[PDB]
Write a protein that binds this ligand. Structure first.
Ligand SMILES: CC(C)=CCC/C(C)=C/CC/C(C)=C/CC/C(C)=C/Cc1cc(C(=O)O)cc(O)c1O
Length: 352
Protein backbone atom coordinates (compact mmCIF):
# COMPACT_ATOMS: atom_id res chain seq x y z
CA UNK A 1 0.00 0.00 0.00
CA UNK A 2 1.43 3.33 -1.10
CA UNK A 3 0.31 5.85 1.66
CA UNK A 4 0.94 8.77 -0.78
CA UNK A 5 -1.70 7.28 -3.15
CA UNK A 6 -4.22 6.86 -0.26
CA UNK A 7 -3.55 10.49 0.84
CA UNK A 8 -3.88 11.65 -2.81
CA UNK A 9 -7.23 9.84 -2.96
CA UNK A 10 -8.28 11.83 0.17
CA UNK A 11 -7.10 15.12 -1.37
CA UNK A 12 -8.75 14.32 -4.75
CA UNK A 13 -12.07 13.36 -3.16
CA UNK A 14 -12.04 16.47 -0.92
CA UNK A 15 -11.33 18.80 -3.87
CA UNK A 16 -14.23 17.22 -5.81
CA UNK A 17 -16.60 17.46 -2.83
CA UNK A 18 -15.69 21.16 -2.45
CA UNK A 19 -16.31 21.71 -6.20
CA UNK A 20 -19.70 19.97 -5.99
CA UNK A 21 -20.89 21.82 -2.85
CA UNK A 22 -19.88 25.22 -4.31
CA UNK A 23 -21.57 24.31 -7.66
CA UNK A 24 -25.10 24.39 -6.20
CA UNK A 25 -27.49 27.22 -7.21
CA UNK A 26 -29.36 29.91 -5.13
CA UNK A 27 -31.77 27.41 -3.45
CA UNK A 28 -29.24 24.56 -3.29
CA UNK A 29 -29.96 22.45 -6.39
CA UNK A 30 -27.37 20.70 -8.48
CA UNK A 31 -28.09 21.57 -12.14
CA UNK A 32 -26.73 20.02 -15.33
CA UNK A 33 -27.56 19.22 -18.97
CA UNK A 34 -29.40 21.69 -21.23
CA UNK A 35 -31.98 21.54 -23.98
CA UNK A 36 -31.53 25.11 -25.15
CA UNK A 37 -34.66 27.21 -25.85
CA UNK A 38 -36.67 24.10 -24.91
CA UNK A 39 -36.73 21.81 -21.84
CA UNK A 40 -33.80 23.81 -20.37
CA UNK A 41 -31.58 22.57 -17.48
CA UNK A 42 -31.88 19.45 -15.36
CA UNK A 43 -32.39 19.87 -11.59
CA UNK A 44 -34.57 17.24 -9.87
CA UNK A 45 -32.81 14.42 -11.79
CA UNK A 46 -29.29 15.82 -11.41
CA UNK A 47 -29.83 16.54 -7.70
CA UNK A 48 -31.22 13.06 -7.02
CA UNK A 49 -28.24 11.50 -8.83
CA UNK A 50 -25.53 13.71 -7.28
CA UNK A 51 -26.98 13.34 -3.82
CA UNK A 52 -27.06 9.56 -4.19
CA UNK A 53 -23.44 9.60 -5.45
CA UNK A 54 -22.34 11.62 -2.41
CA UNK A 55 -24.23 9.41 0.11
CA UNK A 56 -21.04 7.21 0.28
CA UNK A 57 -19.14 10.02 2.10
CA UNK A 58 -19.00 9.99 5.95
CA UNK A 59 -18.89 13.79 6.20
CA UNK A 60 -21.49 15.62 8.30
CA UNK A 61 -21.52 18.62 5.93
CA UNK A 62 -22.21 16.31 2.97
CA UNK A 63 -25.06 14.64 4.89
CA UNK A 64 -26.46 18.16 5.53
CA UNK A 65 -26.29 18.87 1.77
CA UNK A 66 -28.22 15.63 1.11
CA UNK A 67 -30.84 16.54 3.76
CA UNK A 68 -31.27 19.91 1.95
CA UNK A 69 -31.48 18.16 -1.43
CA UNK A 70 -34.30 15.95 -0.06
CA UNK A 71 -36.15 19.00 1.29
CA UNK A 72 -35.88 20.60 -2.19
CA UNK A 73 -37.25 17.39 -3.77
CA UNK A 74 -40.18 17.36 -1.31
CA UNK A 75 -41.14 20.93 -2.35
CA UNK A 76 -41.39 19.61 -6.01
CA UNK A 77 -44.85 18.19 -5.19
CA UNK A 78 -46.72 19.60 -8.20
CA UNK A 79 -47.23 16.36 -10.14
CA UNK A 80 -50.36 14.33 -9.21
CA UNK A 81 -48.46 10.99 -9.43
CA UNK A 82 -45.87 12.05 -6.81
CA UNK A 83 -43.08 11.47 -9.40
CA UNK A 84 -40.03 13.62 -10.00
CA UNK A 85 -38.80 14.53 -13.48
CA UNK A 86 -35.94 16.10 -15.41
CA UNK A 87 -36.88 19.55 -14.02
CA UNK A 88 -40.05 21.41 -12.94
CA UNK A 89 -41.56 21.79 -16.43
CA UNK A 90 -41.20 18.08 -17.38
CA UNK A 91 -43.60 15.31 -16.52
CA UNK A 92 -42.51 12.65 -14.10
CA UNK A 93 -40.26 9.85 -15.16
CA UNK A 94 -39.21 6.55 -13.58
CA UNK A 95 -35.46 7.28 -13.74
CA UNK A 96 -35.53 10.55 -11.84
CA UNK A 97 -38.02 8.98 -9.38
CA UNK A 98 -35.83 5.93 -8.77
CA UNK A 99 -32.73 8.06 -8.06
CA UNK A 100 -34.75 10.40 -5.79
CA UNK A 101 -35.83 7.31 -3.80
CA UNK A 102 -32.16 6.23 -3.41
CA UNK A 103 -31.44 9.71 -1.98
CA UNK A 104 -34.48 9.36 0.32
CA UNK A 105 -33.00 6.15 1.74
CA UNK A 106 -29.69 7.89 2.46
CA UNK A 107 -31.51 10.53 4.52
CA UNK A 108 -33.82 8.10 6.37
CA UNK A 109 -36.93 9.10 4.38
CA UNK A 110 -37.69 5.82 2.53
CA UNK A 111 -40.90 5.40 4.57
CA UNK A 112 -42.00 9.03 4.23
CA UNK A 113 -45.47 9.65 2.74
CA UNK A 114 -43.86 11.18 -0.37
CA UNK A 115 -41.44 8.29 -0.86
CA UNK A 116 -44.30 5.76 -0.52
CA UNK A 117 -46.32 7.71 -3.14
CA UNK A 118 -43.38 7.96 -5.56
CA UNK A 119 -42.54 4.23 -5.14
CA UNK A 120 -46.20 3.41 -5.90
CA UNK A 121 -45.99 5.57 -9.02
CA UNK A 122 -42.97 3.54 -10.23
CA UNK A 123 -45.19 0.47 -10.32
CA UNK A 124 -47.27 2.11 -13.08
CA UNK A 125 -44.14 2.08 -15.30
CA UNK A 126 -43.69 -1.72 -15.09
CA UNK A 127 -43.98 -3.33 -18.55
CA UNK A 128 -45.35 -6.72 -19.57
CA UNK A 129 -41.72 -7.90 -20.19
CA UNK A 130 -40.79 -7.20 -16.54
CA UNK A 131 -38.76 -4.00 -17.04
CA UNK A 132 -39.47 -0.31 -16.22
CA UNK A 133 -40.32 2.33 -18.88
CA UNK A 134 -39.03 5.92 -18.45
CA UNK A 135 -42.24 7.72 -19.45
CA UNK A 136 -46.00 7.30 -19.53
CA UNK A 137 -47.05 8.00 -23.12
CA UNK A 138 -49.90 10.49 -22.37
CA UNK A 139 -47.60 12.49 -20.01
CA UNK A 140 -44.62 12.89 -22.39
CA UNK A 141 -46.85 13.40 -25.48
CA UNK A 142 -48.61 16.25 -23.52
CA UNK A 143 -45.18 17.92 -22.94
CA UNK A 144 -43.87 17.55 -26.56
CA UNK A 145 -45.18 20.17 -29.02
CA UNK A 146 -43.14 19.34 -32.18
CA UNK A 147 -45.37 19.08 -35.30
CA UNK A 148 -43.39 16.26 -37.06
CA UNK A 149 -43.62 14.15 -33.80
CA UNK A 150 -47.40 14.63 -33.19
CA UNK A 151 -48.28 11.43 -35.13
CA UNK A 152 -45.22 9.23 -34.44
CA UNK A 153 -44.98 6.27 -32.12
CA UNK A 154 -43.64 6.97 -28.60
CA UNK A 155 -43.01 3.22 -27.99
CA UNK A 156 -39.23 3.90 -27.88
CA UNK A 157 -39.50 6.45 -25.04
CA UNK A 158 -42.35 4.51 -23.30
CA UNK A 159 -40.88 0.96 -23.53
CA UNK A 160 -38.80 -0.90 -20.96
CA UNK A 161 -35.34 0.61 -20.54
CA UNK A 162 -32.48 -1.44 -19.08
CA UNK A 163 -30.61 1.61 -17.66
CA UNK A 164 -33.73 2.77 -15.78
CA UNK A 165 -34.66 -0.80 -14.72
CA UNK A 166 -31.17 -1.28 -13.26
CA UNK A 167 -31.48 1.96 -11.23
CA UNK A 168 -34.97 1.06 -9.95
CA UNK A 169 -33.63 -2.38 -8.99
CA UNK A 170 -31.33 -0.57 -6.48
CA UNK A 171 -34.55 -0.18 -4.45
CA UNK A 172 -35.17 -3.30 -2.32
CA UNK A 173 -38.96 -3.16 -3.03
CA UNK A 174 -38.37 -3.64 -6.82
CA UNK A 175 -35.18 -5.75 -6.92
CA UNK A 176 -37.03 -9.16 -6.92
CA UNK A 177 -39.67 -8.07 -9.51
CA UNK A 178 -37.00 -6.73 -11.96
CA UNK A 179 -34.60 -9.71 -11.56
CA UNK A 180 -35.69 -11.87 -14.54
CA UNK A 181 -35.75 -8.84 -16.94
CA UNK A 182 -32.21 -7.92 -15.83
CA UNK A 183 -31.00 -11.50 -16.31
CA UNK A 184 -32.53 -11.99 -19.82
CA UNK A 185 -31.17 -8.68 -21.16
CA UNK A 186 -27.47 -9.47 -20.53
CA UNK A 187 -25.53 -9.72 -23.83
CA UNK A 188 -23.45 -12.71 -24.87
CA UNK A 189 -20.34 -10.52 -24.09
CA UNK A 190 -21.43 -10.07 -20.43
CA UNK A 191 -22.52 -6.44 -20.58
CA UNK A 192 -25.88 -4.66 -20.68
CA UNK A 193 -26.87 -1.85 -23.04
CA UNK A 194 -28.90 1.18 -21.95
CA UNK A 195 -31.43 3.36 -23.75
CA UNK A 196 -30.48 6.97 -22.88
CA UNK A 197 -26.75 6.49 -22.22
CA UNK A 198 -23.97 6.04 -24.78
CA UNK A 199 -21.65 4.32 -22.28
CA UNK A 200 -22.66 0.68 -21.52
CA UNK A 201 -20.47 0.73 -18.38
CA UNK A 202 -23.26 2.72 -16.61
CA UNK A 203 -26.00 0.13 -17.25
CA UNK A 204 -23.63 -2.81 -16.77
CA UNK A 205 -22.36 -1.60 -13.38
CA UNK A 206 -25.86 -0.77 -12.11
CA UNK A 207 -27.32 -4.09 -13.29
CA UNK A 208 -24.49 -6.18 -11.85
CA UNK A 209 -24.78 -4.21 -8.56
CA UNK A 210 -28.55 -4.96 -8.36
CA UNK A 211 -27.89 -8.67 -8.97
CA UNK A 212 -25.12 -8.64 -6.32
CA UNK A 213 -27.42 -6.89 -3.79
CA UNK A 214 -30.04 -9.68 -4.13
CA UNK A 215 -27.50 -12.25 -2.83
CA UNK A 216 -28.73 -15.10 -5.11
CA UNK A 217 -25.85 -17.47 -6.01
CA UNK A 218 -27.61 -18.14 -9.33
CA UNK A 219 -26.73 -14.54 -10.37
CA UNK A 220 -23.01 -14.76 -9.48
CA UNK A 221 -21.94 -16.16 -12.91
CA UNK A 222 -23.67 -13.21 -14.63
CA UNK A 223 -21.88 -10.78 -12.31
CA UNK A 224 -18.49 -12.39 -12.99
CA UNK A 225 -19.18 -12.28 -16.78
CA UNK A 226 -19.87 -8.51 -16.41
CA UNK A 227 -16.65 -8.05 -14.40
CA UNK A 228 -14.71 -9.90 -17.12
CA UNK A 229 -16.24 -7.54 -19.71
CA UNK A 230 -15.19 -4.56 -17.53
CA UNK A 231 -11.64 -5.90 -17.37
CA UNK A 232 -11.60 -6.02 -21.25
CA UNK A 233 -13.06 -2.45 -21.43
CA UNK A 234 -10.31 -0.99 -19.19
CA UNK A 235 -7.07 -0.68 -21.16
CA UNK A 236 -3.71 -1.11 -19.38
CA UNK A 237 -3.28 2.70 -19.02
CA UNK A 238 -6.35 2.63 -16.70
CA UNK A 239 -9.17 4.06 -18.80
CA UNK A 240 -12.14 3.02 -20.90
CA UNK A 241 -11.54 4.26 -24.47
CA UNK A 242 -14.49 5.41 -26.58
CA UNK A 243 -14.85 6.62 -30.19
CA UNK A 244 -15.44 10.16 -28.73
CA UNK A 245 -12.62 9.87 -26.12
CA UNK A 246 -10.11 7.44 -27.58
CA UNK A 247 -7.65 8.44 -24.75
CA UNK A 248 -10.28 7.75 -22.06
CA UNK A 249 -13.77 8.75 -20.86
CA UNK A 250 -13.85 9.88 -17.22
CA UNK A 251 -17.57 8.89 -16.94
CA UNK A 252 -17.20 5.47 -18.54
CA UNK A 253 -13.99 4.77 -16.52
CA UNK A 254 -15.66 5.68 -13.22
CA UNK A 255 -18.61 3.37 -13.90
CA UNK A 256 -16.18 0.58 -15.01
CA UNK A 257 -14.29 1.04 -11.72
CA UNK A 258 -17.59 0.57 -9.80
CA UNK A 259 -18.28 -2.59 -11.83
CA UNK A 260 -14.81 -4.00 -11.00
CA UNK A 261 -15.53 -3.64 -7.23
CA UNK A 262 -17.89 -6.63 -7.58
CA UNK A 263 -14.92 -9.03 -7.58
CA UNK A 264 -12.57 -8.59 -4.60
CA UNK A 265 -10.49 -11.80 -4.98
CA UNK A 266 -9.01 -11.74 -8.55
CA UNK A 267 -5.51 -10.17 -8.70
CA UNK A 268 -5.94 -8.92 -12.32
CA UNK A 269 -9.20 -7.13 -11.33
CA UNK A 270 -7.48 -5.55 -8.29
CA UNK A 271 -4.61 -4.34 -10.55
CA UNK A 272 -7.10 -2.92 -13.13
CA UNK A 273 -8.88 -0.95 -10.35
CA UNK A 274 -5.49 0.41 -9.16
CA UNK A 275 -4.75 1.52 -12.77
CA UNK A 276 -8.17 3.22 -13.11
CA UNK A 277 -7.66 5.06 -9.79
CA UNK A 278 -4.24 6.27 -10.97
CA UNK A 279 -5.60 7.56 -14.28
CA UNK A 280 -8.60 9.29 -12.66
CA UNK A 281 -6.27 11.00 -10.14
CA UNK A 282 -4.06 12.26 -13.05
CA UNK A 283 -7.14 13.57 -14.96
CA UNK A 284 -8.62 15.73 -12.18
CA UNK A 285 -8.74 19.48 -12.95
CA UNK A 286 -7.30 22.11 -10.61
CA UNK A 287 -10.78 23.13 -9.38
CA UNK A 288 -11.47 19.51 -8.30
CA UNK A 289 -13.78 18.64 -11.24
CA UNK A 290 -13.30 16.12 -14.03
CA UNK A 291 -13.87 16.92 -17.74
CA UNK A 292 -17.53 16.37 -18.75
CA UNK A 293 -18.17 13.05 -20.44
CA UNK A 294 -21.69 12.05 -19.26
CA UNK A 295 -23.22 11.59 -22.72
CA UNK A 296 -27.01 11.44 -22.79
CA UNK A 297 -28.61 10.59 -26.08
CA UNK A 298 -32.03 11.49 -27.33
CA UNK A 299 -33.45 8.75 -29.58
CA UNK A 300 -36.41 9.45 -31.78
CA UNK A 301 -39.54 8.69 -29.69
CA UNK A 302 -40.37 5.65 -31.90
CA UNK A 303 -36.84 4.13 -31.66
CA UNK A 304 -36.78 0.97 -29.51
CA UNK A 305 -33.14 0.23 -30.42
CA UNK A 306 -30.86 3.29 -29.98
CA UNK A 307 -27.78 1.01 -29.77
CA UNK A 308 -28.62 0.17 -33.43
CA UNK A 309 -28.86 3.88 -34.46
CA UNK A 310 -25.60 4.72 -36.28
CA UNK A 311 -26.38 8.43 -36.85
CA UNK A 312 -25.62 9.95 -33.42
CA UNK A 313 -24.17 13.44 -33.54
CA UNK A 314 -23.07 15.70 -30.64
CA UNK A 315 -25.73 18.46 -30.41
CA UNK A 316 -23.22 21.22 -29.51
CA UNK A 317 -21.14 20.40 -32.69
CA UNK A 318 -24.02 20.39 -35.26
CA UNK A 319 -23.73 23.31 -37.72
CA UNK A 320 -26.99 24.85 -38.98
CA UNK A 321 -30.53 23.52 -38.40
CA UNK A 322 -30.65 20.85 -35.74
CA UNK A 323 -32.98 18.88 -33.52
CA UNK A 324 -32.52 16.93 -30.31
CA UNK A 325 -33.59 13.57 -31.81
CA UNK A 326 -30.52 11.64 -32.93
CA UNK A 327 -28.23 13.88 -30.92
CA UNK A 328 -26.09 13.55 -27.80
CA UNK A 329 -25.88 16.13 -25.05
CA UNK A 330 -23.49 16.31 -22.09
CA UNK A 331 -23.20 17.70 -18.58
CA UNK A 332 -21.91 21.23 -19.38
CA UNK A 333 -21.32 22.05 -15.66
CA UNK A 334 -19.21 18.83 -15.15
CA UNK A 335 -21.35 18.20 -12.02
CA UNK A 336 -22.80 14.87 -13.19
CA UNK A 337 -19.33 13.55 -14.26
CA UNK A 338 -17.55 14.83 -11.17
CA UNK A 339 -20.12 13.26 -8.80
CA UNK A 340 -19.72 9.95 -10.66
CA UNK A 341 -15.94 9.96 -10.44
CA UNK A 342 -15.80 10.96 -6.78
CA UNK A 343 -18.25 8.18 -5.86
CA UNK A 344 -16.15 5.57 -7.71
CA UNK A 345 -12.98 6.73 -5.91
CA UNK A 346 -14.60 6.65 -2.44
CA UNK A 347 -15.92 3.10 -3.12
CA UNK A 348 -12.62 1.82 -4.65
CA UNK A 349 -10.11 3.29 -2.17
CA UNK A 350 -10.51 0.62 0.58
CA UNK A 351 -9.88 -2.17 -2.02
CA UNK A 352 -6.57 -0.54 -3.15
C1 LIG B 1 -34.12 8.96 -18.16
C2 LIG B 1 -32.91 9.59 -17.65
C3 LIG B 1 -31.62 9.12 -18.21
C4 LIG B 1 -32.90 10.69 -16.77
C5 LIG B 1 -34.05 11.30 -16.11
C6 LIG B 1 -34.32 12.65 -16.88
C7 LIG B 1 -34.68 12.35 -18.33
C8 LIG B 1 -36.06 11.97 -18.69
C9 LIG B 1 -33.57 12.31 -19.34
C10 LIG B 1 -33.68 11.85 -20.81
C11 LIG B 1 -33.69 12.96 -21.80
C12 LIG B 1 -35.03 13.60 -21.82
C13 LIG B 1 -36.14 12.98 -22.60
C14 LIG B 1 -35.20 14.76 -20.95
C15 LIG B 1 -36.53 15.45 -20.82
C16 LIG B 1 -36.65 16.68 -21.70
C17 LIG B 1 -36.94 16.28 -23.12
C18 LIG B 1 -38.32 15.82 -23.43
C19 LIG B 1 -35.89 16.40 -24.04
C20 LIG B 1 -36.05 16.10 -25.49
C21 LIG B 1 -36.83 17.03 -26.30
C22 LIG B 1 -37.36 18.22 -25.80
C23 LIG B 1 -38.17 19.10 -26.60
C24 LIG B 1 -38.66 20.32 -26.05
O1 LIG B 1 -38.38 20.64 -24.84
O2 LIG B 1 -39.45 21.05 -26.74
C25 LIG B 1 -38.44 18.73 -27.91
C26 LIG B 1 -37.92 17.53 -28.43
O3 LIG B 1 -38.21 17.20 -29.70
C27 LIG B 1 -37.13 16.70 -27.62
O4 LIG B 1 -36.62 15.50 -28.10
Amino acid sequence: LLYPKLNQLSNSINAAVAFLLEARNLEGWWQDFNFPQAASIGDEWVTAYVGTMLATLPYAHVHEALMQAWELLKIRDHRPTGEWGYNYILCGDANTTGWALQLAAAVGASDSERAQQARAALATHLQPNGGIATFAEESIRAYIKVPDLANVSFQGWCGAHTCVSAAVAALPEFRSRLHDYLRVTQTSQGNWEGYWWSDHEYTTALTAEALAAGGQAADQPSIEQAVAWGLKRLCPQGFVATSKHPNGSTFATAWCLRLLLLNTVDAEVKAARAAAIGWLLEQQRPNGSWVSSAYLRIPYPFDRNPNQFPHWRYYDEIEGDKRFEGSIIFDHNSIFTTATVVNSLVKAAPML
